[PDB]
């Protein structure tokens, strides 16, 4: 694999978001992945709708939580592969509730055909990311309320609880690291990003990695 990859500088990653008081990290992870995969398939970089998942994907639990793989499966099996634009289905859950699903009045911004579940191996995830783009992952975020910048050390790695998006890595650095997009505003971390050490399963980052497939 290349020594380093950073998709943020290559036109593939939209702005950092704010999930607010809702337990919707799963939806930010899944949609951020779709956004990146759609661009890398040769389509314009488009802002897509987390609200579609939070209100309409009844195989997940709204502001009480969900799974990225369930969300990818719902899009294809129940929603004809469609992912609506942000502008046509804007985020409505920042106060912490999921309003009833709206089943018309939206415009499709992207489509997917399926998803892949990646190996539980950091070198294999990096190799896939270098060619095919950003990857949805789950982490233990319990230590992330202390992060202020730099490459974090000694991440608490006990229980997966938070969905996020891998956007790059650097194996040439003094301590090799992953680059991760969070959904806690740009005032948190490094303009909304976190770097964690790579190669020691920090925060359980290798355990639940997956991606949508765009045809």
Single residue of 5, 31, 67, 83 touching ligand T10 by CB under 6 A: 67
Single residue of 65, 81, 114, 199 touching ligand T10 by CB under 6 A: 65
Q: Determine, following the binding rule CB under 6 A, whether residue 62 of this chain makes contact with ligand T10.
A: no
Residue number, 68 or 203, with CB nearest to ligand T10: 68
Q: Determine, following the binding rule CB under 6 A, whether residue 208 of this chain makes contact with ligand T10.
A: yes
Sign of CA dihedral 39, 44, 45, 47: negative
Phi, psi values for residue 178, rounded to 5° = -100, 150
Q: DSSP secondary-structure letter at 95?
A: T
Q: Determine, following the binding rule CB under 6 A, whether residue 84 of this chain makes contact with ligand T10.
A: no
Window 123-142: residues binding ligand T10 (CB under 6 A): 138
Active-site residue set? 25, 162, 182
User: Which pair of tokens denotes residue 140?
Assistant: 């233990």
Q: Determine, following the binding rule CB under 6 A, whether residue 32 of this chain makes contact with ligand T10.
A: no
Q: Determine, following the binding rule CB under 6 A, whether residue 33 of this chain makes contact with ligand T10.
A: no
Using CB under 6 A as the binding criterion, the count of chain residues that bind ligand T10 stands at 16
Kindly state the helix (H) or strand (E) to which residue 39 belongs, with its residue range. Answer: helix 25-40
Binding map of ligand T10 across residues 144-183, x = CB under 6 A, - = no contact? ----------------xxxx--------------------
Single residue of 5, 16, 26, 193 touching ligand T10 by CB under 6 A: 26
Residue nearest to ligand T10 (CB): 23
Residue number, 50 or 176, with CB nearest to ligand T10: 50
Single residue of 35, 50, 57, 60 touching ligand T10 by CB under 6 A: 60
CB 138 within 8 A of CB 162: yes
Region of 160 (left: φ > 0; alpha: ψ -120 to 50; beta: rest) is: beta
Single residue of 7, 12, 17, 23 touching ligand T10 by CB under 6 A: 23
Determine how β-strand 135-139 pairs with β-strand 162-170. antiparallel
Determine how β-strand 193-197 pairs with β-strand 151-152. parallel
Would you list the DSSP string of 110-178? EE--EEEEPPS-HHHHHHHHHHH--EEEEE--TTGGG--SSEE-S---S---EEEEEEEEESSSSS-EE
* Residues forming the site for ligand T10 (CB under 6 A): 23-26, 60-61, 65-68, 138, 160-163, 208
């Amino acid at each position: 694999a290349p020594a380093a990859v950073d998709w943020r500088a290559r036109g593939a990653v939209t702005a950092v978001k704010d999930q607010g008081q809702c337990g919707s990290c799963w939806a930010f992870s899944a949609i951020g992945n779709v956004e990146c995969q759609w661009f890398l398939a040769g389509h314009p970089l488009t802002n897509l709708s987390e609200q579609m998942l939070v209100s309409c994907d009844k195989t997940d639990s709204g502001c009480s939580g969900g799974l990225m793989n369930n969300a990818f499966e719902w899009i294809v099996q129940e929603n004809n592969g469609a992912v609506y634009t942000e502008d046509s289905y804007p985020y409505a859950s920042g106060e912490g509730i999921s309003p009833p699903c709206t089943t018309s009045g939206h415009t499709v911004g992207a489509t997917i055909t399926g998803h892949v579940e990646l190996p539980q191996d950091e070198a294999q995830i990096a190799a896939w990311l270098a060619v095919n783009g950003p990857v949805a992952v789950a982490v233990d975020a319990s230590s992330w309320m202390t992060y202020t910048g730099g490459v974090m050390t000694s991440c608490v790695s006990e229980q997966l609880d938070h969905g996020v998006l891998l956007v790059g890595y650097n194996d040439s650095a003094a301590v090799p690291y992953w680059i991760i997009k969070n959904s806690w505003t740009t005032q948190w971390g490094e303009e909304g990003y976190i770097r964690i050490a790579k190669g020691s399963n920090q925060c359980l980052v290798k355990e639940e990695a997956s991606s949508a497939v765009v045809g």
